[PDB]
């Protein structure tokens, strides 16, 4: 419904400033679909290398951010920072960041409202473990996650929003969800956002799918309605990302 | 105090900006410093580039956190090579606030410790037991218990790259500094449980520095006793004062 393509690639922890030129030297050379919205999200430390050099029409995302403007947290970055380096974006809720690293669904909401607060537009991951699906809690464990922040910001935060469906077990693992499994999860969401929150957020939120996610099943994911594109991990490192930022052509 | 080179270290924490930041740099690289002390300032992630390339080279810059691995699956992490690969030679690890807030266990930190000496870091490891710890007798226990985590994963010589930072929690941005024999007593059992568990070099060549409320007040004190071998300062590093601390012993 006028939801514009989204493509985002988390490169996660990878990269060197050799590599990373590589990678930029390419997404800067290459023929892009005129109506995707891309957004890389490089490590905090090449933020300003990729900022500085890479093609104006991608926006760059942080991987994460805290909670508070500025104070005594050793190994942490501020929203107020990334706005300073020209940063528009954010990661947020990661799959990786929820589990190994503990971050709790208010901690991810605390996160997403700062953010927000503060000039930062945030790419939201939610997504369910293999033992939550085979345990047929695939819909509450998402909706639980997305209620957290629904709770906290107001109806036109949502249009800084993007929210990633990411299943754990889709993960880096080479099991992609087929386009049916994904369709269904999507569709619930959006219809959870039109009880909760308004039938606007639904129709006009970006919903992208990521988990293993490559240049050969992105096209059939693509064509399902509520499917509006991609965060993608390990394919983002490589030229084929090109192909999946093209996935809605021919 | 025995040949150990006085070691001043700034924990900028989460503070700054392009501006604010270039401020500090120029009162650095403008100040009057004793060539005796080795100085090494901390910036966040996102700064590091910027405060490595405009800094006076005679002051080290180190990262506040790393992670474990070479490279992976880690959103919002920084590796060890990346640091190595960005010209940052020191990393601090253990800092209490990621142990407190971020749930950063010994052995965790031990793991970021041994791979950081491994790939070519100096690491600032610090240790420090809370008020409830000491209420109930245990400020020994906790700190030694802390150190083995390290001793029992690094090399002898690896030594040669750490320096300890005593941090007491009840200190850190409290304006509740350690008195002189206070900080001296927790040191010299520190030098001893090195003496006693590496080696009686690793001992006498350990720089052991504290951290918690120091300032340009009551560095000079601080310096004077024969174990403590510079400071982890963390609110008046942002602060012209951070020059008297350095020149603390002159």
Redesign the interface.
Known sequence: MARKFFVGG?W??????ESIKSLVETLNNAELDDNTEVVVAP???????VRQSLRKDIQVA???C?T?A?????????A???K??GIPWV?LG?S??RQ???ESDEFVAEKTKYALDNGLKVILCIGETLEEREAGKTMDVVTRQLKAIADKISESDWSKVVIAYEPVWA??TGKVATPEQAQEVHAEIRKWLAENVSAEVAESTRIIYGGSVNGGNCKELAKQPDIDGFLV??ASLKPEFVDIINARQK
């Not at 996660?12 to 400033?17: D, L």
């Not at 490590?43 to 290398?49: K, N, V």
């Not at 500025?70 to 501020?78: Q, R």
């Open positions: 988390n996660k922890m990878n990269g060197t400033i490590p905090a430390i090449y933020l300003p290398l942080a991987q994460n805290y508070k500025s104070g005594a947290f050793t190994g942490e970055i501020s107020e920072m990334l300073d380096l990661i990661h990786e960041r190994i690293f503990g993960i880096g991990g390990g």
